[PDB]
Amino acid sequence: ETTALVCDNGSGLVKAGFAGDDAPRAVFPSIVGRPRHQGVMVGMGQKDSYVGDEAQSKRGILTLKYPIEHGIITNWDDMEKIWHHTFYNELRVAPEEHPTLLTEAPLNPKANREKMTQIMFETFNVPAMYVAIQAVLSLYASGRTTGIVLDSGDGVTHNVPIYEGYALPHAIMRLDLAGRDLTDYLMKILTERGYSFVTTAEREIVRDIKEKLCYVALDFENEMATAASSSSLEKSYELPDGQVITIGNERFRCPETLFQPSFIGMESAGIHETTYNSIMKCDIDIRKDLYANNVMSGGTTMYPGIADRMQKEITALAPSTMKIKIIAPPERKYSVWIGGSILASLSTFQQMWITKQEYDEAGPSIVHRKCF
Template sequence: MNTPIICDYGSAFSKVGFAGTDQPRSIFPTILGKFRYDYPKVGLDKEDCFIGREAQDKRSQLSLQSPISRGVIVNWDDMEKLWHYAFYTQLHVAPEKHPLMLTESPTISMEDKEKVSQILFETFNVPALNLSNQGVLSLFASGYTSGTIIESGEGMTYFVPIIEGCPLHLSTLKTDVAGQDLTLYLLKLLSKGRNVLVGTVDQECIRQMKEKCCYVALNFEKEKGNLDPCTKKFQLPDGEEITLGQERFFCPEALFQADLIEKNSLGIHMWAYKAISSCCPSLWKVLFSHILLSGGTGSCNGLQQRLQREMSELVSPTLVVKGFSIFKDVASSTEPILMQPDEVCCEKYLTGHIYSNIG
């Protein structure tokens, strides 16, 4: 059987590649773009749909949307186009010749699992399919089999306690405070600062600004009282520059104080504490001592140190809290690729033959 394909689709980015390799073969934005009704098409490409970076590059002409919103597939037709693009345009493979490992949301519904399986088996004719919990793969990629994964991406943040490779579903929690909320909050902060250049910047540019300039303050109140905040300049595509001051740490503070973005939610330290505390007390030691941050938002500078400090204040002195950040850069994240699925999960593949018999 040919080398398995591994696909990891998120609300912001998709990563695809082959099992056993060190890097994804391709990373591209999880977006599709269609021409706006009012945009003249004379002299432009005749394609009615653009995907990934091509859609991003043409965003001034297109209406962009992602088939995944808040960790849930919301447009199955577009998702099918995205799979087709990944197989044929990015990987240049025939999907019917390769087993497929697909990462799934830690809280995916059974209905969505069935729909994913149906499309991949019946439309793309994959010979075997493995739907794997993203949190488990992230943990394996870090070299652990037990611990707590905080998977914070563009649309959702998940808290997944895992013991010996098995996610504890009843203790898995989620919040919709995530990357896209921080991007909008940064835009709001810059607008409040009467930065005249903000009106000329699109949301993608603000997202890049957030990732390159923002950091989590170890002590928010102390940082806020600093009369001489550390500023950083960000160059816009047109060459103009925006200077960020307190916005740099106010933006990601919303992960700990959701009321800043007008959301009624716990801070991520409280969510993590709640998820672990709901597990059997005999598991607390390993779950608190191996807390791993993953995902694009989870890689924010300073988040690991702040999370460890906040959670250490919540637990008994006999428990040690240790936080780790798995990957620093979403553009080079290899968490699903570092897995060796043939060795670890081969028994979890559902073959097309079995699917046809139970389908």
């Protein structure tokens, strides 16, 4: 009949699809390119801007911009280009026919939701929509009603404790560390070894290096002692021009800055200490049930060994007599989408949508009272 669209804007990848199917059928980077060189050949069909995988294919000749930075949409016309491309090109569905479900990080400005709703109603003319919290959807995705979700995409990291379906909004922690600034750190440490990656395309090469070769050390000092004392840890990667580059302690040393943000120069504690300091803000009767479920979400939690490092140092911080259990399903990169796909298909949820009648009556202000 009619099936809601489910869209998660993220930073980096857009992933989108229809409610009640199990994985997104559109996935592509939320990136817009504009050509920067003088075009020479007449009659080429040359185009004003490129979106998604087009801008990845041609990225040699493009300036690449991300329209979302730390979960805040900074540039709105490019975000409208990304949604226009998503609905018409990727899904090939007319948005007037389908409710749309949209996903956001907690504690980000309200103007972002007001503009997202004004755009979805006025330009797209979407009949109904909703804005959902990224972390809440990872519980729907992992089959739980209780747990402290740790979520990290590109941009924002946040912890959200939930207990039997009640959020605890005073205990929500948010951190801007994750994912892009790891790449801007890797580009800085790789220069030490004599490699220089400046352009926005070279940043995409370093992002691919990070996704292939980085891993998290169980003990950071033992492994720096080992990699100073050996070649055994060292891996080599082939650049798109067929050069070959060799990467040593940098590969474990890059994601350690998740646990020691002072490397990039932040003043806040690592994700393990924001997790523990988030559990410490919950009332003592429920802490046992948060230690028994920790749910990792989003791509920045994909590094090998990040679960066992998290469990090791949280088990160091926690009182000795409790199970600490870290839950990290291999699919977790899509968990926020799978959770929104579940949520949008419930029958109880069909009264939750903001309808255009209500937007017309109350204006975009309504989103704050109706949505979370």
